[PDB]
Write a protein that binds this ligand. Structure first.
Ligand code: PLP
Ligand code: PLP
Ligand code: DTB
Ligand code: DTB
Lengths: 755, 748
């Protein structure tokens, strides 16, 4: 979890291609910054070249160092300068003939510096972090020279350098094009993504440069980056006009004078000649950052005045507890805290943004570009009686997986609630058709949640969190039963009206058990006509992360099916790997007539909902009249955007190559939550119960402690939303068990405050 | 009318001089110099845009090398090379002038090469620059037409269209090439860069293409020894073939013929890939209608009545146009105006569609979905500010996000009823509304709708019709004159304008409205809900503005909260940003969606007064509005909405914005509407902003729909009501063409 400081501007230097002048621009910006009239000791420019090849014959760091020495003289303005190279492949080092020592990963730490100090003068610090000998792509030179550096090490090195030095301006010069591979192979635009630093883009003033520059620009935006400015060397083709036009003048486009082809040339007079451009560029960088900071510092307060947040008692919320979310990268938020030193820090989205969340960083980027493409290709196109690829693919994918062996029809809606409202309309038709029909009631389990619109509320049990002053029209339209629950406690699974293991709970033989008889009777009793059964299989989510007894639900399903009462599975929470399977029919060992999915359906990127039905449920609306039809429809039904996004997610989550958590038989995820730490936490004194399965870790505390924990977890870079006395951790389908292990660890420590 | 019987691909490149022409030549030779036989075999090579001509001619190159390879392979072929148009300068060197320029070598019964250069300039620079410098210009649509002409003129067959420069190099008019060809959305291949720095170059080019909605069947590049293909294949996740040509000979005098021969394997793979991708594409296209019938459950659709022949296969959209696939035609793609605005969501022109695409991409990459409650993030906040600074100006101070119209209504109702019970220390709460108004399909939204057959027991057994419903007077044009129609319980303006005029508060109808309403208004009425100005789903009825304002004032006098449902009306649908502009009065609560997001994605919003906001302020969390959808204020919609709110409103991005800045210029040809309203089939017309509606006299409707479609106009009937709905940025010309087609069809 990084801690990026924003007190001082730090920009990446991007280019459309290699050898367009990134280093010339860095040098120009550096000189413009350090060589101003009133020379302050406080002024410092940090220049970083994380990746270098063609070294030592090619050194951008030595170049910046060298030219600033020269310009200093020229301008008769003294400055301290230093140039260091931190690591190097063995080959490269022998070029400096250093007979150094070699790391496990073939990398060497170099004792290499050039300094020329003036005390009290402004300061240039150039650093090259890692350098290879071969003047080739970093991914290739790493191979050839057996010197490797993993992506996180590179980000750590950079973070170290930044904090080590935090007036101040920091430039980070990339290597090659925007989408050139770094050492490990990862494209540079992706490698640096976790920081999401602002940037500038050195373009191409040569014939063909307009396209080059726009493509590069677009690859950056598509990664979520911001670009303060564009700059390129003039080649007499008036390239800036098209670019400014394309940019709609929303980003300055600066044009350097033509650069000397004569290779002997100093470039000193050229720098002098380009002062105006580098000046503008520096100004643009410095301002953009202030402005970004200014906005950041005002967002919490503004939100407080302007937003009306859902499920939020505003009176109780103050600017200090509003969270400023600058961006996301996989499971991590980038949170801004001004009361800090005005910095960005990571936080694990442990609540999975209301249980929508899934994508790792890699998948987030894939989806971004599939979304862009679907936007450009389809926008929103009219659904009724039309067909279009992403809707159709998505439908096929739903039926070939989640709806396999039962569902034959797919009904699109916008969210969970709308899919439920539609499910209810399907069950009641089916039911009245089979019983030639009055007042139709639903049967459900107390604690189940099914959406917040009025239809969806009626299927929810009459609690204080659902009645008069929340919905005047709610009239408890159901028969509600109390489910048995299942929970881990003191290292052992239990039922509350001992299981050998969690798997035994799910075992289907419990049908022969005494509780199966007991259930059958209790239900048979109760079971104004009951026209539909609706459940949250396995977990009551909003109800406080309770695990219901699978046995209890299967029985109930069977009891209702025996009475020609349609069965609804509300898998808006459980669907698509939340609980370690693609559908809980895998866990309950039984099929519904109707089922609803959303949240993870779209991979946490955008709203889309779906309601799958049997051919027979489908058949109860077949008639000659448009009046028999199911006349429910939202204008954005099956919007290409969600559909495409869902088709990508359904495949990606399910695929052993894209999701390393997928089992050998590919129907389940590997266990993600460390067994030991699970057992421990389960046996702590504060903890009343634990429920753990798939991507979900929930505990209920014995309120007093709850508020404490939340804060301490946050302090630890873990963002999660309390649910009464229930505290939870919810990862994505693709989250590594190594990250879960770190979570449970932090959580267990914090309980330690409760011995 | 693009034919798909025969593959047609664009040839793209990451940069200029990477070998597009070498690849086109390779593919051509691989296709024509097939051992087998056919005189039926024909390759169409098009270079729409050429500069550096006549010293640079890609057409002459393709022609020349195929002559040579023909000999080498001892396989005869007919070849021709023509240049159609040229700048004056270029013509002299052998405005925009026509050329009678052809080279032919014909062989009887042989396969055929046809190379054509459509337009050529002399300077060797960007097409947009040479166009100014040589005063030879060609507008984008002319270029697309020229291409279309050439394709149809020749429709076994393979057609290549070689671009000029990079993916994003300007064409003659300045338009980026990736954008200029967008309306065709032809599949393509991408010649990459095997030099140092070519991995980045190639990926960026690829991504600018995808971000335009293009498909790429393959990538190819010349080997320079850097093993560039590995990163590319890995990035592409091997879902697109990456092919590697051998190094082109370094000797300048080299005829390249042996190189072509050496590269045969790569070109034949490439050709295979192109031909296959196309078959596979047409085969999916041919099976989609049927599949949809088996697999989809469409909304508001009686499936029994729908057959594969009336399912519409929509391959893509570009601004207001669908690209529709019809096998019945010529296995072809043809355009159709989305006259129904895809259930009244639609707005973006082609240019705006592309802008939004990339703003969406970026928001996806930057935010994904991030948790809303008690958090703040740029696009949510911007969007909120933009909502309050515009639509909610002078009344609204709070913004509540939801997913769609229906959810925003359900939330509005919960706000009005609290406000109402707080002011009256409160029972059974009932709504007051106008019969015909529609407010969403979820159960709360239904309750505020009047008990009709299209909303009863069959539709939702829990519907109870929880409201007092009144019959609105309506307003319509007829025989060239606007009129009012009072309902039976109740009881000719110069212009439509005379209807919205606040001078009518003093009128007699204002007095009689006040009374009629006042009576019922004296089971408590806890909220008023309306569709201002237009009852949309109700059959595009215009209500009397006067009637609604009065009603609003009557309820406000009784401390009954007022809800404006602007899910349909908001954001320029009716020529204003909000109908408070038309009704001349403010609500306490209002809902927006559909055009809110510019027709791109779902997002809804419910704006409230500070006082409505205040009735939920308490010490209890129980006291709060406990309504929330997991995707509340998803960054995606919010960003998209912030872009649309600004773009539609902005006189530079939307040329329909009036000098006042408050309204849109009339879009529907006034005399045309006159005629159509005077027609014997037509019972009434309603026209305002982006909406044209007519009702036919009490069959024929089915006829019209089909005839309109035949004319490239897609629209959805609404009873006897037929409508045309454009976007906020649609040019009045295009509307003029629509009304024309419609009027002709009535002529039947
Ligand atoms: C989240 C959820 C819903 C509602 O989904 P939204 O998209 O948030 O409206 C319905 N049922 C269950 C079980 C859920 O978890
Ligand atoms: C379309 C519409 C709605 C419903 O919006 P959806 O997003 O389609 O659910 C509600 N009220 C009116 C007036 C509408 O036009
Ligand atoms: C050489 C290509 N063939 C041609 O006729 N002109 C092209 C060159 C123009 C490309 C301009 C690139 C740019 O957009 O910057
Ligand atoms: C020569 C540049 N300077 C440097 O240090 N390495 C760059 C070279 C590698 C970039 C090429 C990767 C690509 O093909 O995209």
């Amino acid at each position: 979890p990084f801690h990026l400081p924003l007190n001082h501007p730090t920009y990446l230097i991007w280019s459309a291609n290699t050898s367009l002048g990134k280093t010339l621009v860095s040098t120009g910006i550096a000189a413009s910054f350090l060589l101003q009239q009133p020379s302050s000791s406080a002024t410092k420019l940090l220049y970083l070249k994380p990746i270098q090849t063609g070294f030592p014959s090619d050194s951008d760091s030595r170049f910046v160092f060298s030219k600033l020495d020269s310009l200093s003289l020229r301008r008769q303005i003294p400055i301290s300068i230093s140039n260091s190279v931190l690591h190097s492949s063995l080959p490269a080092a022998k070029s400096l003939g250093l007979n150094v020592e070699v790391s496990e990963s073939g990398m060497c730490s170099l004792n290499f510096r050039d300094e020329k100090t003036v005390t009290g003068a402004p300061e240039l610090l150039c650093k090259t972090l890692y350098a290879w000998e071969a003047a080739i792509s970093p991914h290739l030179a790493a191979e050839r020279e057996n010197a490797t550096v993993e992506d996180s090490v590179v980000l750590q090195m950079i973070e170290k350098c930044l904090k080590e030095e935090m007036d101040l301006l920091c430039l980070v010069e990339t290597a090659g094009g925007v989408a050139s591979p770094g050492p490990s192979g990862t494209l540079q635009c992706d490698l640096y993504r976790p920081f999401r630093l602002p940037g500038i883009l050195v373009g191409d003033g040569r014939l063909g440069g307009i396209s080059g520059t726009i493509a590069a620009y677009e690859s950056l935006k598509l990664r979520g980056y911001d670009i303060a400015a564009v700059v390129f060397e003039d080649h007499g083709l008036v390239n800036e006009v098209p670019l400014t036009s394309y940019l709609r003048n929303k980003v300055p486009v600066l044009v350097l004078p033509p650069v000397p082809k004569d290779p002997s040339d100093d470039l000193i007079e050229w720098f002098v000649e380009s002062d105006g451009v580098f000046k503008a560029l520096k100004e643009t960088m410095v301002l953009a950052n202030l402005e970004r900071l200014e906005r950041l510092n005002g967002m919490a307060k503004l939100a407080g005045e302007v937003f009306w947040w859902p499920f939020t008692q505003h009176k109780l919320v103050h600017q200090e507890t509003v969270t400023v979310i600058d961006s996301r990268c996989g499971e991590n938020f980038s949170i801004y805290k001004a009361s800090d030193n005005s910095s960005l820090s990571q936080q694990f989205d442990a609540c999975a943004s209301w249980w929508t969340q899934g994508p790792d960083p890699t998948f987030q980027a894939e989806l971004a570009r599939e979304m862009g493409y679907t936007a450009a290709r389809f926008g929103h196109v009219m659904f009724p009686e039309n067909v279009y690829e992403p809707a159709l693919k998505c439908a096929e994918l739903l039926l070939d997986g989640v709806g396999k062996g039962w569902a034959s029809r797919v009904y699109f809606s916008d969210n969970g609630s709308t899919a439920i409202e539609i499910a209810l309309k399907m069950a009641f038709r089916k039911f009245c058709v089979d019983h030639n029909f009055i007042v139709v009631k639903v049967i459900a389990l107390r604690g189940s949640y099914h959406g917040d619109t009025l239809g969806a509320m009626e299927a929810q049990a009459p609690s204080p969190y659902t009645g008069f002053l929340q919905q005047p029209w709610y009239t408890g339209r159901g028969l509600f039963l109390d489910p048995p629950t299942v929970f881990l406690s003191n290292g052992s699974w239990n039922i509350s009206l001992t299981f050998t293991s969690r798997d035994e709970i799910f075992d289907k033989s419990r049908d022969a058990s005494t509780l199966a008889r007991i259930y059958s009777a209790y239900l048979s009793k109760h079971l104004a006509h009951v026209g539909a059964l609706i459940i949250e299989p396995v977990i009551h989510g909003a109800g406080g992360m309770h695990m219901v007894d699978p046995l209890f639900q299967r029985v109930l399903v069977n009891e209702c099916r025996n009475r020609k009462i349609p069965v609804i599975f509300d898998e808006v929470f459980t669907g698509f790997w939340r609980l370690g399977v693609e559908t809980t029919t895998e866990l309950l060992g039984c099929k519904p007539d109707i089922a609803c999915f959303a949240k993870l359906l779209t991979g946490g990127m955008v709203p889309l909902a779906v309601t799958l039905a049997t051919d027979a449920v489908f058949d109860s609306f077949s008639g000659d009249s448009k009046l028999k039809a199911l006349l429910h429809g939202h204008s954005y039904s099956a919007h290409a955007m969600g559909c495409a996004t869902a088709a990508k997610a359904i495949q990606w989550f399910k695929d052993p190559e894209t999701n390393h958590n997928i089992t050998s038989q590919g129907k389940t995820l590997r266990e993600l939550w460390d067994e030991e730490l699970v057992q421990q936490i389960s046996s702590h004194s504060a903890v009343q119960r634990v429920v753990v399965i798939g991507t979900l870790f929930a505990l209920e505390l014995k309120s007093l402690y709850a508020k404490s924990l939340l804060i301490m977890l946050r302090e630890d870079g873990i963002f999660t939303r309390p649910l009464g006395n229930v505290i939870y951790l919810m990862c994505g389908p693709c989250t590594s068990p190594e990250i879960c292990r770190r979570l449970l660890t932090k959580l267990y420590k914090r309980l330690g405050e409760f011995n």
